[PDB]
């Protein structure tokens, strides 16, 4: 395939990536809160040095989205998820008390 266009969009690009059974999904944390549009995910521990560009995969091995923003301490920080709106989340199945993972 290929891609080459000159025109960005306001809404985030539905990040849909399925992870195979060869990757090890580690528990990044769990949805602690939700932003008007974005989602807040609280970490736990033993979290690797991942940057925003880092994509967060769901429990069903589905790229929920890339880190929209990170805040908090260095041991118990919180990662945010980008989403067009509340709905965008409901669909993904993300919600409070939901443990996420990364690749």
Swiss-Prot record:
Q: Which domain of life is it from?
A: Eukaryota
Q: List the subcellular locations.
A: Cytoplasm; Nucleus
Disease as annotated in the protein's UniProt record: Pulmonary fibrosis, and/or bone marrow failure syndrome, telomere-related, 7: An autosomal dominant disease associated with shortened telomeres. Pulmonary fibrosis is the most common manifestation. Other features include aplastic anemia due to bone marrow failure, hepatic fibrosis, and increased cancer risk. Phenotype, age at onset, and severity are determined by telomere length.
Quote the function comment for this protein: RNA-binding protein required for the maturation of box H/ACA snoRNPs complex and ribosome biogenesis. During assembly of the H/ACA snoRNPs complex, it associates with the complex and disappears during maturation of the complex and is replaced by NOLA1/GAR1 to yield mature H/ACA snoRNPs complex. Probably competes with NOLA1/GAR1 for binding with DKC1/NOLA4.
What is said about its interaction partners and assembly? Answer: During assembly of the complex, component of the small nucleolar ribonucleoprotein particles containing H/ACA-type snoRNAs (H/ACA snoRNPs) which contains NOLA2/NHP2, NOLA3/NOP10, NAF1 and DKC1/NOLA4. Interacts directly with DKC1/NOLA4.
Write out the similarity annotation. Answer: Belongs to the NAF1 family.
Q: What is this protein called?
A: H/ACA ribonucleoprotein complex non-core subunit NAF1
Organism the protein comes from = Homo sapiens (Human)
Tell which residues of the whole protein are contained here: 181 to 276 of 494
């Amino acid at each position: 395939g290929s891609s080459g266009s000159s025109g960005e969009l306001p809404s985030v690009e539905e990040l849909t990536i399925i992870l195979p059974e060869d990757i090890e999904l580690k528990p990044l944390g769990m949805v602690s809160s939700i932003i008007e549009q974005l989602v807040i995910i609280e970490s736990m521990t033993n979290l690797p040095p991942v940057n925003e560009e880092t994509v967060i995969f769901k429990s069903d091995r589905q790229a929920a989205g890339k880190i929209f923003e990170i805040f908090g301490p260095v041991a118990h920080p919180f990662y945010v998820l980008r989403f067009n709106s509340s709905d965008h989340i409901e669909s993904k199945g993300i919600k409070i008390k939901e443990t996420m993972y990364f690749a």
